[PDB]
Each structure stands twice: as structure tokens, then as C-alpha cells.
Amino acid sequence: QNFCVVELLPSDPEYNTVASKFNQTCSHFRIEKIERIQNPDLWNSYQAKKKTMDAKNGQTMNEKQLFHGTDAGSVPHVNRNGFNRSYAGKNAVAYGKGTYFAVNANYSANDTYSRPDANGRKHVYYVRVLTGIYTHGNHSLIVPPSKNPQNPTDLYDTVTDNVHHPSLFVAFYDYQAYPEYLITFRK
Ligand SMILES: O=c1[nH]c(CSC2CCNCC2)nc2cc(NC3CCCC3)cc(F)c12
Numbered sequence: 001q002n003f004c005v006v007e008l009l010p011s012d013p014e015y016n017t018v019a020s021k022f023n024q025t026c027s028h029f030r031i032e033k034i035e036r037i038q039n040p041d042l043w044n045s046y047q048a049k050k051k052t053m054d055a056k057n058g059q060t061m062n063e064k065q066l067f068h069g070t071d072a073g074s075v076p077h078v079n080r081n082g083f084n085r086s087y088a089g090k091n092a093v094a095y096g097k098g099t100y101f102a103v104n105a106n107y108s109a110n111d112t113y114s115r116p117d118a119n120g121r122k123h124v125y126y127v128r129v130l131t132g133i134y135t136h137g138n139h140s141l142i143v144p145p146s147k148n149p150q151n152p153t154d155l156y157d158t159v160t161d162n163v164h165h166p167s168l169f170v171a172f173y174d175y176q177a178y179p180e181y182l183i184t185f186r187k
């Protein structure tokens with residue numbers, strides 16, 4: 001549960017890459033800084049889960065990079081515990097009980113998700129999520145649904161709002177998503 005935080009220099013190839021993807025829908029926001037979260041436990045759980053997904057879903061590209069807006073209050077919890085069950089309790093439920101990730105930063109940048117702190121600062125993560133093989137989510141899914149309702153040994157990895165034109169993804173467990181970068185920004 002130990003972690004380090006490293007601020008990225010605006011001059012760093014890594015900074016450019018992250019800002020570039022943030023600015024595809026959020027260029028009208030001012031970036032205050034970008035930190036890399038380094039949580040060795042959360043990382044090793046994630047890489048291990050990625051290895052077994054790659055052995056299992058054949059040609060599927062299991063890894064996506066998605067945005068997660070949140071309040072300042074949640075940042076320490078997430079940097080430590082990841083996107084775990086207690087955190088999942090604080091998310092919406094319309095597409096299932098888990099943590100919600102947007103394809104486009106400007107979804108996450110809504111004030112409902114990345115609530116502005118007393119100084120007007122907004123917080124959005126650029127998360128590695130193992131979306132793997134996914135299906136339409138709904139409110140009743142409080143665990144990953146089975147492909148076959150008669151066989152719970154074949155589970156979907158995540159759920160989405162729309163399988164063929166997805167806007168968001170719900171992940172159920174902490175080993176499925178790594179909060180790699182935290183973007184602090186303002187209007
Ligand atoms: O990025 C996002 N972060 C969060 C966490 S919000 C919460 C954190 C704890 N403190 C209070 C604020 N939720 C989202 C929900 C989305 N869509 C759902 C809206 C209703 C149906 C689908 C899309 C998103 F991009 C996000």
C-alpha cells in the first residue's frame with residue numbers, strides 16, 4: 001500500500017503524450033500539472049492480470065487508456081488502494097457496481113465527476129484499464145456477468161454503455177485498472 005508520486009516536466013516526451021490525449025477534447029482547459037503515481041503492489045497485480053488476459057482472449061487488445069474524473073478527497077485513497085470495492089461504492093450504478101472510465105477526457109472533465117476543489121482545481125486520471133472482452137452493463141450487475149448463465153467460470157472482463165460504439169467502461173476489481181497519471185487542471 002506504499003506509493004511515490006513523480007511530477008512530469010512539461011518538457012518530457014511522456015508529458016506531451018498524456019497532454020496530447022487529454023487535449024483531444026480538453027484543449028479549452030489549462031493544465032496545472034501531471035504526476036505519475038508509482039504504487040508497486042497495484043502495478044504488479046495489474047501486470048499479472050494483464051499477462052493472464054493476453055493468454056486467454058487470443059487476438060483481443062485487452063488494454064485501453066481511459067480518463068477518470070474525481071474529487072481531490074479521493075486522490076490519496078486511489079493512489080494507495082487503486083479503484084477498489086470501497087471506491088466503487090462512490091461511483092454511479094446505472095451500468096453496474098464498479099469504477100467508471102470515459103474514452104474521452106471531456107466526459108471525465110464534467111464537474112459532476114472531477115468536482116472543482118475550493119481553488120477551482122479539477123482532477124482526472126489517465127488510467128490503464130484491462131477492458132478485455134466486454135458486454136452491455138446494467139444496474140443488476142454487482143459482479144462481472146458470465147457469458148453463459150449456467151457456467152460462471154467464463155466471465156466478461158468489463159461492461160460498457162454500447163459494445164460497438166463505447167463511451168465508458170466499468171471495472172469491478174482493483175487489479176483491472178492502474179491510475180498511472182493524475183492531471184490537475186482548471187477552466
Ligand atoms: O470519469 C468519471 N469519474 C467518475 C467518478 S464520480 C465521483 C468520484 C467520487 N466522488 C464524487 C464524484 N464517474 C464517472 C461516471 C461516468 N458516467 C456515468 C454517469 C452516470 C451513468 C454513467 C463517466 C465518467 F467519465 C466518470
Ligand SMILES: [Cl-]
Nearest residue numbers: 049052053056
Ligand atoms: Cl485473466
Ligand SMILES: [Cl-]
Nearest residue numbers: 144155156157
Ligand atoms: Cl475478471
